[PDB]
């Protein structure tokens, strides 16, 4: 992309692409604050359930980050919320927060 501006057909495209990348950086910062809100909140909810979950989704901070990030592209299942125990109150809170 460094030598791309030299072309008349692809020059304007690479310039406009760089403009949007700068533009979305400000919007990405706002989503980071939202992303960090649910990462801490859902990790706290599911930290105590390590061996009591279908998967290890929200158990640790790293895994809470991984589960929430890949939910952006629809690559995280809804079974991230389901608990093995009958603590339906905590499970339904996870359903609402994830929703």
């Amino acid at each position: 992309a460094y030598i791309l501006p030299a072309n008349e057909s692809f020059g304007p495209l690479q310039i406009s692409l760089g403009r949007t990348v700068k533009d979305i950086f400000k919007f990405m910062v706002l989503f980071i604050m939202v992303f960090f809100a649910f990462m801490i909140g859902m990790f706290i909810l599911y930290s105590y359930y390590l061996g009591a979950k279908v998967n290890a989704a929200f158990t640790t901070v790293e895994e809470s980050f991984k589960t929430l990030f890949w939910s952006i592209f629809g690559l995280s299942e809804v079974t991230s919320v389901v608990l093995k125990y009958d603590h339906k109150f905590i499970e339904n809170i996870g359903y609402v927060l994830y929703g």
């Binding site: 809100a37 901070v61 603590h87 927060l97």
Partner: protein
């Protein structure tokens, strides 16, 4: 718990032999004390704002309602945890005064207070501790809205 809890939710770890497990789980820490003080101060400020202006003046603001909502849940979670702590304390007091059976392993406790030696799996679905952390997670999420 940043890297997770070493102990499984099925095993109870008590520091000293005659401790009720629920006492250790539900006891407040120093960080818990500061958070409660912080929430109490923020709730106090919100009440003064409401008192001087009245309901209608205060109720029609997006930040004021959300601040009242997150502080109500924060107080709700702490009240539930204190109720769970009080129940554990009642079991603990009975244990150290009516049981002399060397670490609460061989002795069979009455079912009312025997429940306070169970791990997370055997907890009731509606016991205050589970309700406490269920509501506490909601308040933590709502906190970052004030950013």
């Amino acid at each position: 718990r940043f890297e997770g809890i070493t102990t499984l939710p099925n095993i109870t770890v008590t520091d000293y032999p005659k401790q009720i497990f629920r006492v250790k789980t539900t006891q407040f820490t120093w960080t818990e004390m500061l958070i409660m003080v912080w929430v109490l101060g923020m709730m106090w400020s919100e009440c003064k704002e409401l008192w001087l202006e009245g309901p209608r003046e205060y109720i029609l603001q997006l930040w004021n309602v959300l601040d009242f909502g997150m502080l109500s849940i924060f107080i709700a979670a702490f009240t539930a945890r204190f109720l769970a702590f009080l129940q554990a304390t009642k079991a603990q007091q009975y244990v150290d005064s009516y049981v002399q059976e060397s670490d609460l392993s061989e002795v069979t406790l009455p079912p009312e207070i025997q429940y306070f030696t169970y791990a997370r799996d055997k907890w009731l679905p509606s016991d205050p501790q589970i309700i406490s952390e269920g509501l506490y997670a909601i308040a933590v999420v709502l906190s970052f809205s004030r950013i």
